Curated annotation (Swiss-Prot):
Tissue expression summary: Highly expressed in retina and brain. In retina, abundantly expressed in photoreceptors. Isoform 4 is the predominant isoform expressed in mature olfactory receptor neurons and vestibular and cochlear hair cells. Also expressed in cells with possible sensory function, including peripheral retinal ganglion cells, cochlear interdental cells, and neurons of the circumventricular organ (at protein level).
GO CC annotation terms, alphabetical: cytoplasm; membrane; photoreceptor outer segment
Cysteine pairs bridged by disulfides in the record: none
Mutant phenotype after disruption: Mice appear normal at birth with no obvious behavioral or growth abnormalities nor overt sensory deficits. At 6 months and 1 year of age, mice display normal retinal histology and normal response in electroretinograms.
Stretch of the intact protein here: 22 to 138 of 243
UniProt name for this protein: Pleckstrin homology domain-containing family B member 1
Any one GO MF annotation of this record: protein homodimerization activity
Protein origin, superkingdom: Eukaryota
Source species of the chain: Mus musculus (Mouse)
Amino acid sequence: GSSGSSGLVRGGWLWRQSSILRRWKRNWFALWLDGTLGYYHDETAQDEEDRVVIHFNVRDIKVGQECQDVQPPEGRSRDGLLTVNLREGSRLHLCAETRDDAIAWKTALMEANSTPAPAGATVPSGPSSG
């Protein structure tokens, strides 16, 4: 709603595990201020694959060892795994190259899930001399 969404939080590449192919694949996940999560084929949002709710929607999120029914792809390590749970029930199988990345997503998500935004009236006002 709110005429869609305006403003991006983060945008990186993460490994997602498929169901029919049961294999990890490269995917670009981008979080919106509106409180939504959409991943497209590549950085360029041209062919939207899907869109899930983030605002008060994320039930839980695991990272690394936390994982229970997930395995790291080739090269990567268990110190990167990361899965997100949705209130709707369905979850999201992901895996960060490193633990750092995983945590970043876990925190960036957990927050947006339980943290609203003043989105409404703001100005780019900033520095001038320099």
